[PDB]
Amino acid sequence: SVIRQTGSSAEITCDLGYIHWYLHQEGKAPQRLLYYDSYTSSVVLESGISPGKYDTYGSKNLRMILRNLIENDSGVYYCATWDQNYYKKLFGSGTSLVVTDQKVTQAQSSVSMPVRKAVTLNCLYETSWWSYYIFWYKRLPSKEMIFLIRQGSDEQNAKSGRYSVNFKKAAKSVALTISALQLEDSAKYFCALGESLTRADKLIFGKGTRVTVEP
After folding, report:
1. Both 72 and 138 in a single domain?
2. Structural domains of the chain, count
3. Please, where are the H alpha helices in 30-122?
4. Are residues 86 and 13 in the same domain?
């Protein structure tokens, strides 16, 4: 939770070989800004992103500095990395900054359920790829993206714990159902697409869907 003001600079740190910095702005879906390889010190910026705006350093050490702040840099920044077995991308703690003066859509609306009752969150996705993965995450009030489930474009339906994906490739729909909804499940759930399991592969996110378990 970091206040700052235009023309200034900001140092997001990271508490996790390739690291991916994402930016998550209000009401928008999270997006990769770039990814950086420690080994090579190489950096690869995404389309439109301007070089010399984001500086990245480290390998305790890993940080990103933003160079010329502007209210649009406002948002919450995350560092990310593929798990050691590429089952999932792991996300860092999350850092909200405030500067002061292939498609994925989850249009479903804030939902409210009572406790110990199921909820199915919808997620529809567009893609040119023959093969890809879908990852569902839970964004906590602390702003931490937790990983939940992954559905493979060629697997049977995902089940893990209370989590269930009903996979419908023909219609590219992947709604997550959480089973015994409990108070703590009250969160915002993001649905993500990826193409392959590789150091460089990014995640394309929906804008997510608030769940509120009620007693």
Report:
1. no
2. 2
3. none
4. yes
Kindly state the helix (H) or strand (E) to which residue 209 belongs, with its residue range.
strand 209-214
Number of other residues whose CB lies within 10 A of the CB of residue 126: 11
**What method did the depositors use to determine the structure?**
X-ray
CA distance 193 to 202: 8
Q: Do residues 34 and 98 both lie within one domain?
A: yes
Quote the CA–CA distance of 158 and 196 in Å, as a whole number.
18
Does residue 132 fall inside a structural domain?
Answer: yes
Residues 56 and 146 both lie in one domain = no
Write down the residue that tokens 């479903």 correspond to. 108
Query: What are the structure tokens assigned to 203, written together?
Result: 């995640």
d(CA 154, CA 160): 17
User: Are residues 89 and 44 part of one domain?
Assistant: yes
Exposure b/e, 48-67, CB count within 10 A at least 16 = b: eeeeebbebeeeeebebebe
* Residues making up the chain, counted from first to last: 215
- Give the burial class of 212: count Cβ atoms within 10 A of its Cβ; 0-12 exposed, 13-18 middle, 19 or more buried: middle
The residue segments making up the domain with residue 116 are 104-205
Amino acid identity of residue 103, one-letter, is K
Q: What does this entry list as its resolution, in Å?
A: 3.0
Instruction: Give me the CATH number covering residue 125.
Output: 2.60.40.10
Q: Which amino acid is at 89?
A: K
CA distance 123 to 120: 10
Nearest residue to 89 (alpha-carbon basis) of 123, 27, 136, 33: 136
CA-closest candidate to residue 121, choices 25, 191, 171:
191
